Design a protein around this ligand. Sequence first.
Ligand code: PLX
Ligand code: PLX
Ligand code: PEE
Ligand code: PEE
Lengths: 105, 98, 113, 83, 347, 70, 115, 175, 318
Amino acid sequence: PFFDVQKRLGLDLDRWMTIQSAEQPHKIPGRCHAFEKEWIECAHGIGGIRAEKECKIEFDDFVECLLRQKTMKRLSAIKRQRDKLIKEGKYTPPPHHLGKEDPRP
Amino acid sequence: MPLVYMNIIMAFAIALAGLLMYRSHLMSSLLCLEGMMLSLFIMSTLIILNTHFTLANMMPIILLVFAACEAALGLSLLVMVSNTYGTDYVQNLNLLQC
Amino acid sequence: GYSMFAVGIGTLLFGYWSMMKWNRERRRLQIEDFEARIALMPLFQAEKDRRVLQMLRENLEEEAIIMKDVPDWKVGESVFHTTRWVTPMMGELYGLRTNEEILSATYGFIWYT
Amino acid sequence: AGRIASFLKNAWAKEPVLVASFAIGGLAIILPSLSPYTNYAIRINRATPYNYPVPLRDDGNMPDVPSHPQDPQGPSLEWLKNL
Amino acid sequence: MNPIIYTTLIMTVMSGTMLVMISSHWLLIWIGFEMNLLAMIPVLMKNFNPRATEAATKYFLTQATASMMLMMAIIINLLYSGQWTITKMFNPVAMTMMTMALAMKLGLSPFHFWVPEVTQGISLQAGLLLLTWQKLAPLSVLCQISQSINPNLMLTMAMLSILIGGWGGLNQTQLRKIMAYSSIAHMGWMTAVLPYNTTMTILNLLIYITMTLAMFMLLIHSSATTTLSLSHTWNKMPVITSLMMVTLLSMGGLPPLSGFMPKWMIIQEMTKNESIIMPTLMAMTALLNLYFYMRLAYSSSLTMFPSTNNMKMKWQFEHTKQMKLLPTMIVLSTLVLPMTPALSSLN
Amino acid sequence: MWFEILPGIAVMAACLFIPGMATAHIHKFTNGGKEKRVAHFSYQWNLMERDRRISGVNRYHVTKGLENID
Amino acid sequence: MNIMLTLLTNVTLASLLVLIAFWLPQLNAYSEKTSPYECGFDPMGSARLPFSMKFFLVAITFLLFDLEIALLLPLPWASQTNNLKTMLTMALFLLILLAASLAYEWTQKGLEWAE
Amino acid sequence: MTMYIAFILSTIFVIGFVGFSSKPSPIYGGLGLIVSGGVGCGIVLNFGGSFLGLMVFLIYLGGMLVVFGYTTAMATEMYPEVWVSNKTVFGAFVSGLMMEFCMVYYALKEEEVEIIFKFNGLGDWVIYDTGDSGFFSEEAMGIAALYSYGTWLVIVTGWSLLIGVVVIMEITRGN
Amino acid sequence: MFMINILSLIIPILLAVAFLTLVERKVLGYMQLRKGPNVVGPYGLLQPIADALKLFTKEPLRPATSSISMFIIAPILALSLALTMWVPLPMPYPLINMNLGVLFMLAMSSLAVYSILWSGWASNSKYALIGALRAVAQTISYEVTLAIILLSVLLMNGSYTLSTLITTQEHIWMIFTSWPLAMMWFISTLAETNRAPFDLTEGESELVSGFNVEYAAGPFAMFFMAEYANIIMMNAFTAILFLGASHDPHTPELYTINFVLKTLALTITFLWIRASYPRFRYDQLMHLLWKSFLPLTLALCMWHISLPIMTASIPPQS
Ligand SMILES: CCCCCCCCCCCCCCCCC[C@@H](O)O[C@H](CO[C@H](O)CCCCCCCCCCCCCCC)COP(=O)(O)OCC[N+](C)(C)C
Ligand SMILES: CCCCCCCCCCCCCCCCC[C@@H](O)O[C@H](CO[C@H](O)CCCCCCCCCCCCCCC)COP(=O)(O)OCC[N+](C)(C)C
Ligand SMILES: CCCCCCCC/C=C\CCCCCCCC(=O)O[C@H](COC(=O)CCCCCCC/C=C/CCCCCCCC)COP(=O)(O)OCCN
Ligand SMILES: CCCCCCCC/C=C\CCCCCCCC(=O)O[C@H](COC(=O)CCCCCCC/C=C/CCCCCCCC)COP(=O)(O)OCCN
């Protein structure tokens, strides 16, 4: 079913391309390199069954970096509250958020 | 997820449906198969670019290579069906039953 | 026929020699301007750090003002369990800004032609 | 020796395009392995600094790492200027 | 077809399967499936005629659809985790799509319609290949991702495969369609035990491949593809029909024959996981396969059908070509039950 | 031719001179007179964006020399 | 954003030329005038009948050789790598199998048009 | 948010897919697939995939030219069908159009899990990365890596292309 | 100010096409011991204006059996793509500066063929269909060779950026390093623009007017404009690719003049070639591209991959 010829011969036929944290050209990093490094090191050698429970924190952080679902939710909440308080005139946006900032290098 | 991702997955579903529901011509189904490949290429490319997996930039090209092989394979079979019947209709191929 | 083929091969050899010299010189020039970029990179990194941190602080203060009435909202609460620094998402940095800055930040380089 | 002679004769007389194509292909295949400059090309590619050279934390046990770019230690590109 | 070309194509089919079996990357597994299909389409049409063309066309359409679905599942899995390694799928939707794609590649019910038609449309050698070697790759992939798969969908398709194999086989007089429905039911048996013990899947596959190779080689040796054409073999080669009779009973799963071992091992493993009901259904339904095997044995070996006058001329000629592994295959198909504890070497 | 073919050739040449000269002049006119900046890579785009920010007039072309560091 | 404006301008100019061509001149259309041209006479069959393709095999082969181009276009960038011996070996290997597939179809009479 | 260009492009992508999936005459199916390939080129270009976008556009142009030849050779009928010449083709086209409409509405005005998961919208620009470095294109680097990292991939794809030539020769032989 | 540049590029190109028609008529005239247009305007200068005005005041007809939508779309696509193909050309600066300009040129050219295919099919006429199938065959004939020739020549450049070709040739024309590829490229551009002896699609002697026989008035003039624009565009590209003109940053007008002279020379060479040779049979063109050009092109691609490595001459800008 899975004859691990690569591991028996030490070949690396396709393992160079399986993960995002593995030796990219010119050392260009993946967007989620640290999260994946952490999740891989947390779950290494403990087996699949233990890794899903005991490394769920690292994997949840990794998935958040990948898809950013909670970040978009928080931004949407903030902007809805801003829209609501602006419509009634309660809140006034600062100049550096309207296009009149003092830009810095 | 993003609106763009939803649209590409919808394109795959529509092409898959098109392949599944045959009409008269075989060429139309072959086109649907190509459409599925096109949507897979776009989806994988968007995911790869977004996450900056650098080495995975080559897999959509491999995808295209195999898609071309499949397309070539499909056209050969169509040539043989048309030579047999003078038409590329699905209804003609009913010789074998279950 | 010999004369024609000989003129052709001589032309090719002259061209090869010239291009060899010119491309070696071009590679030296590229190394030189790459090294200029290398000498300049620390200053750019320092001011990029300060710019990112300032935008995040401004967003944090505006969010402390905007989200004061909502009952159970921690201002500046992270969405990650980890405590290490996470590179800010583009939306987070420019979330509360004008559409022109957001356009320039997302598509400015791609569209520049 | 004389079979292949008349064979290449007939080929040059009937299909000079294929003769030239096989000659150019064979040269392209074999000549790069006999060249003294292939290593020069590898070295030129290695000397191109695409990304920032991250400095090392000095521990007092690095006699061959420079402490300033113009110090004599480290690689030299002198071979490249004279190339 | 030039013999060298045929050898190159068989080697490409086998190398695509081996690529599926040795790869750690989902893209390489997909490439293995693609290469296998590419080389396999010409082998179906080796003997050219409209039926072979139609069979190859139905095969290509089914397998290419499965391939697109498989790729889509891989891409969704990558979207929800930046992973290319084939371990356990991360997304439930990707797993459903993957399971259905591999079921279509195997011909499990309700995707079973293609197997009888394509098998009937091709020669006995291509049918042998299609029903033995073409199962290894999707089964190995399914064995790798077994923990991830949902039991309800898998067992539904397996029970459907057993039922539909039996019912469809009851109606056939063509031997290739009988073999195809037999294969569908056997696949159902192999996949029913997959979420519990992949070693039982491997054992079932090995015994099924042995019995199927024996049956196809016996059908080639006595060049028959219908029931009535096989009814003549007694008047030319009685040993062949006796051996086919015993091989047929082994397929039926009757003890003390080898064919009974996979059924026996699968039922026992399932009972351990507190699943009494599914197995009772499976065995009582395999009774149908046994019925149409027994019908073929009645017409072929246990009674003597009328013959023709021109058979006397065939009496004077020996077979030009002899199969080297046919004798070994029959012995392994019938007399291997006392060696059952050797299954531990499979895990 | 035969030299009566030359007037049409000259008209065609004058028409073909226009695009390149117009692009050069428009580039110089809308880039401070100094040859529109090329950004093939993101480092060059970052240089341009920094230049735009420090000019104070929101134009990348305006250049600040040593007279801007007191 | 500039390329989008360019494409829009070009398509708009062409469409305006078509519009002028159809709305400026006098129109006198009748059935004889609008009928199909076949050099003086009425066509026998339809122009939508199947038209046999005698180079049908070179057309399928073009599909596979066109994807060889997608695998060879990154070669200017591949030349910048450090292990040039692996890059050159791989690039050479790719073109050799492209030459062998051309030699196969050529020697098996695959480049001759159907008769 | 900003101009929603990529949203319009992906909607036109879906529309071209509905165009050729409605299964009308192949001349119009290939037209729909060409339109889809072009707008998908545009979609990928808007994310930094210049090479991949231009490449898929080129490949599909070549493929559809071959398909046009084959359509005139073997797919012709006295009256080729368009999207409005048939109740069946028109119905499939309209159902696909308003199905995309319903998906897009339900997704952008509230937040529903259609089949896999949910989405609120916001425009694609939010998920970008604001990374500042490089004298190169990372796409071009990852694609060039096929000749130094991807030796195995080059081997299997070259073998499959040679076998594909052999295979089409075997299939179209006849006898 | 960018629309000013777009119009600055386009209005001149259409005028140059108009007068290329006159130059071709006069050059073919003088090679045939006659004069060509010398009556409408001094030296036939006003002949293109009369032709254009005559074409856009004549009745355009839509054939009864034709598919009207594609019939009308095809010339729009032709002319708009012919205009679009000019925007990345560095003369010495491009209107649109692209990283992959060569590859954009390839894709747009490859899309240009559909207009001929669609127009022939839309017409629903026998001769139009025969012309369209000849176009299919022509693309299959030259498409693979043309792309690999560009790749081989471009290896020395280091990228697909068109403006880099000026720097690549600061000291020598790239034709002194690749004149075999230059010959095959010239013939492939003859075939790619449907020009004698490779202009099978029009098939004037054989098919009367080929794909555009049905077309009349303004729509016809649009196909004509598109073809002549493509003839100038291909030659300009050929000039930039093989005969780089020295460029002075502080005086780009010198580069512009040099570049325009070289592209005019190449266009006049097309006209000369048309005046000199018999037409290729369409099956023969395929044989010419697949049995002679493709083997040499594969060998020369191998050679041009190996050569910069053998000699340590690899170019900058990965
Ligand atoms: C280089 C590209 C751009 C060039 C720049 C110029 C852009 C030109 C755009 C193309 C149109 C020009 C065509 C020239 C002729 C006009 C064609 C048409 O528009 O005119 C008539 C339009 O008239 C309509 O038939 C009806 C007339 C009124 C319709 C009511 C519309 C609402 C207006 C309300 C009236 C109150 C005053 C309005 C002004 C404020 C059509 O009549 P018809 O005979 O078939 O067509 C043949 C025309 N002939 C005779 C010249 C040969
Ligand atoms: C046991 C049986 C052996 C023979 C039968 C095998 C059948 C399969 C065909 C060949 C097996 C594949 C072996 C090659 C795997 C490639 C990986 C390995 O070889 O390393 C490469 C070594 O490269 C060598 O060139 C090996 C490739 C040579 C193979 C060319 C022809 C061999 C295939 C022949 C059969 C294929 C089908 C038939 C076509 C003729 C790259 O090493 P390197 O670049 O240092 O470091 C990479 C890491 N970096 C990127 C960080 C720097
Ligand atoms: C090791 C180098 C490999 C890489 C370089 C090659 C890359 C691309 C070149 C190869 C392309 C494929 C070539 C396909 C060969 C086809 C052979 C064939 O069948 O054609 C013959 C023509 O060619 C032949 O005669 C058969 C082979 C004869 C020899 C051809 C060349 C073999 C090698 C010659 C040179 C040897 C090496 C160069 C040494 C140069 C001297 C120093 C028949 O012609 P027709 O078109 O059918 O004619 C129809 C009308 N009667
Ligand atoms: C030290 C290492 C050097 C490596 C080798 C480099 C030297 C290579 C030496 C040979 C180079 C030859 C290149 C030529 C490529 C094709 C030659 C060819 O053989 O083509 C002809 C056909 O080609 C033609 O004749 C052209 C037909 C159309 C002619 C169009 C007009 C004529 C050309 C005008 C001048 C060309 C100017 C080109 C460059 C312009 C400047 C950019 C073959 O066809 P047949 O004779 O029929 O034989 C086939 C059956 N055996």
